[PDB]
Design a protein around this ligand. Structure first.
Ligand code: ATP
Ligand code: ATP
Lengths: 515, 523
């Protein structure tokens, strides 16, 4: 009695955190009148002088102005609350019976021990050890009740977890009752069977205060959280319902519950640690399976991000730079450049609302992208109305580069003559189209966002030719006309070497169609 | 009959496949091993009967068990019990899985006990013991693979290079000797166990040379040839492994005389490796729990990495659009077309760029644009302005477009016209270091109207006469000089603090001759 070996007096505690080397967990208490009491001393001595395989152990207590708390061995894994809820990780049926048997074995010694059951043995105040040896906090020692009766409805519900029979709008003893322990065990079993929060029945929905008041008032039919049945067994549910019966006599005793649990677990009939070892091994396997799933998801996400990162590349450098390769600058001997511009667009957009002028430039992108993708061309840049077509830039096509860039304008000049402008349905848009061929030089440019620029003297000549071009006609240069005549099958027309800008007299031809 | 002839017809397929490397990237009783043989015939003599009897009588907690032999002459099978979670070599393969020193020592003592039990029996040595032929079980009960079935073996001369690659675990004495013992001697098994212990002690690969790192064939040939110092690896760099080194030095013994009596070696290890040891079987549970905790830590870190990658992909999805518009589009709301009373438009162009790039190598022309992009993208982030498009060597920047800023937009697109006209003079050209890149700048103010156009690839586009006016104004500028407009000039004069200078009444392709001014500096 005079040993005083239960108190550390806050003198030597490691700065829950560790304490005297051991990493115990401490729960605080809100009280100031706890000085000394012989009965409380005997209760604390009884609480310290107990140990069991399924029961936890008390470590230390502090009752000084610096700290009013009790510290016990810290459970490494999570509490039973989170695990039983599940949907994070799964569990086996034999695992369920192992946990239930451990809880029952602990409760049998707890209730029939130094004193009656602590009463506050909620399903959210018990956890498992490192080797999954279920323990419970579940002792108050007549001093853990930090006085605060005026908390509110949340405390009302978390109490309403308690047995219905004791909770009858009256003050129960702080120690508790055997019926409270029986109902706590029944509630824990129901939570394990249903795996959904605490005290959930089929129903539709239940507020904490509403359900608590309905239970306390007393319905003519017995208010019981009826759990959904299953094909494996139903005697466990019947025992759970009988334990929760309003009549205390109908509630079976701890010995009866233990006998029923043994009968249910008689299928296993294993009493050695081997069951625990197997359960731990299968739990580890389940964890590994979850790990595999999540790493697969991470790989998929990384792949998606990589695919997103290179949307502007011309589908060739994109597949090369992705596969750890490197792309150097290149110069191509002959490429075809095509320009498309809206003629007189600076006036149509003048007399139009911004909402009436943003649905037109967006309705022409969806009309040209359906035809600019059929052929083997590429759109390098697009700023407003002007376009950009380069043929053969990614992979050389030889002499074909001058054939696909000329059939694209003929299929786009007729596809724009039936385009409906919602701002004015009785009007036809005018577009100028120019084509040129010549050597070019290109390469991958950009670090934050990879673009693809074409750098050559032919671009300026093509721009000059396209600028000086009549509407509703395709203007081609002599270099393109050479390849056109070499291939054949298209009707080109001589226009005249008179109208030329930036040079002297240069012959440019008109594209009229291909048979 | 030996009651160990499993029929090919009875149960050939069961539990098709699950990837054994379940880490970072069967017949009516349990899962069984899937192997075969190229003999294509059965000629079991009395020796094969004795081997089958020895296999049937051999029942130990460590050594694996075999269901039976095959029946069909074409397809052979050795239905051995499959111990899960891969092999010890596989266990050390993934560096993500972390061996615990005590845990590794317990594993080594377990394999030592298995080796002693195997040696004491009729089979003097397995003859094929290796790091990859020792798999842990569901409770990490170690076994030895191919430690039996003396009737058949892969003794057919074939794949000499693959022999030098996959039979590297053999002892130097066995390798030097032309005739190899299929049922090897105890000394060879001891040397194989020593090599396995050396591999387990370190974290690197086989033979852990950290030297020339030559091919396995060359190393094996050198070891077979030998010298005064035998070709052999060191132990480790740990200063607290003196006993491990002392045991391993006797383990690399070259002659059978120096070969230790492996039972005595295991006793010495229990003296040294078993530091206070543990209980009969609690150690297994503790070491399994430690491994489970390790896996939990690994998966938590992996989930954190996945969340970071998801955030990165979300950022990468929308970046061309303005930050405010991108947030308003990712939230769920729809951006509508808006008209603004007064905005600032800025044009920048390299003067004579078509001539400097004419006489240049393609690499020397692609290394001059990327460097300029990295030289302007750092000074444009120190102001309050937006970039909407960048086509080649021309820049176009808007001010105040995303969020209305009142009379501040005209006071922000001009302050950046002075920090960019003084940061383009210290630029460096790779292929000509004695030249300065001339730039042309134009600024204008006007009532633009902009929207978020585009499907599946949206971009922010501004429309109105302001763009055309700005282009016309900037098409008649001068290099190394900032040219302003009357609309911007009024706001600049109203704000104060900028020393403007009159320019003249140069005509333009438009309304005609209008007032113009230069921006000299900011007081
Ligand atoms: N394995 C464990 N060992 C010791 N303490 C633990 C363990 N797991 C959780 N705890 C702690 O036990 C406490 C459980 O809740 P707490 O005792 O504070 O609530 P309570 O007021 O008794 O109410 P209720 O049981 O209704 O939730 C928490 O402080 C939690 O951190
Ligand atoms: N129980 C088992 N545990 C681990 N690996 C096994 C097992 N049974 C068969 N294997 C196979 O053995 C491989 C590793 O050993 P190894 O490559 O040496 O082949 P082996 O079939 O065991 O025999 P051998 O030494 O003749 O090649 C594994 O990749 C797997 O395919």
């Amino acid at each position: 009695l005079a040993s005083e070996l239960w108190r550390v007096r806050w003198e030597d505690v490691e700065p829950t955190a560790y304490y005297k080397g051991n990493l115990v967990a401490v729960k605080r208490v809100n009280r100031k009148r706890i000085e000394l009491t012989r009965k409380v001393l005997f209760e604390l001595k009884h609480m310290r002088d107990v140990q069991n395989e399924h029961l936890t152990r008390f470590v230390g207590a502090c009752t000084d102005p610096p700290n009013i708390c009790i510290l016990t061995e810290y459970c490494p894994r999570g509490s039973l609350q989170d695990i039983l809820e599940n949907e994070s990780i799964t569990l086996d049926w034999m695992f369920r019976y192992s946990l239930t048997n451990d809880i029952v074995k602990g409760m049998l010694f707890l209730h029939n021990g130094a004193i009656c059951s602590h009463g506050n043995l909620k399903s959210s105040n018990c956890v498992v050890d490192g080797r999954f040896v279920l323990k419970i906090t579940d002792y108050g020692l007549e001093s853990f009740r930090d006085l605060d009766p005026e908390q509110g409805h949340t405390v009302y519900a978390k109490k309403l977890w308690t047995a219905p029979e004791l909770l009858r709008m009256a003050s129960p003893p702080v120690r508790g009752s055997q019926a409270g322990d029986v109902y706590s065990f029944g509630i824990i079993l129901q939570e394990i069977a249903l795996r959904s929060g605490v005290f959930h029945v089929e129903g539709l929905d239940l507020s904490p205060k509403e359900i608590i008041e309905r239970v306390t008032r007393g319905e003519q039919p017995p208010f019981r959280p009826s759990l959904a049945l299953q094909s494996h067994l139903e005697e466990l549910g019947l025992l759970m319902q009988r334990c929760w019966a309003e009549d205390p006599q109908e509630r079976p005793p701890f010995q009866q519950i233990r006998l029923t649990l043994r009968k249910f677990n008689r299928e296993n009939s294993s009493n050695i640690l081997d069951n625990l070892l197997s359960r731990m091994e299968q739990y580890a396997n389940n964890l590994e399976e979850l790990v595999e799933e999540r790493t697969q998801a991470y790989l998929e996400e990384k792949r998606k991000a990589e695919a997103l990162l290179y949307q502007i590349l011309p589908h060739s450098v994109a597949e090369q730079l992705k596969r750890g390769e490197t792309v150097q600058a290149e110069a191509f001997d002959s490429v075809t450049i095509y320009f498309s511009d809206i003629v007189g667009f600076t006036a149509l957009s003048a007399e139009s609302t911004p909402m009436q002028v943003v649905t037109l430039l967006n309705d022409l992108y969806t009309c040209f992208d359906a035809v600019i993708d059929n052929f083997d061309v590429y759109k390098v840049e697009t700023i407003g109305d002007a376009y950009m077509v380069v043929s053969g830039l990614p992979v050389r096509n030889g002499r074909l580069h001058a054939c696909e860039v000329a059939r694209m304008a003929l299929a786009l000049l007729d596809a724009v003559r039936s385009f409906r402008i919602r701002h004015r349905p009785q009007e036809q848009l005018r577009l100028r189209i120019g084509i040129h061929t010549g050597p070019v030089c290109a390469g991958v440019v950009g670090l934050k966002m990879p673009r693809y620029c074409l750098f050559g003297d032919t671009v300026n000549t093509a721009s000059r030719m396209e600028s000086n071009g009549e509407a509703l006609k395709i203007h081609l240069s002599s270099e393109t006309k050479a390849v056109l005549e070499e291939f054949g099958g298209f009707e080109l027309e001589l226009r005249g070497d008179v109208e030329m800008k930036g040079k002297g007299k240069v012959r440019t031809y008109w594209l009229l169609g291909e048979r």
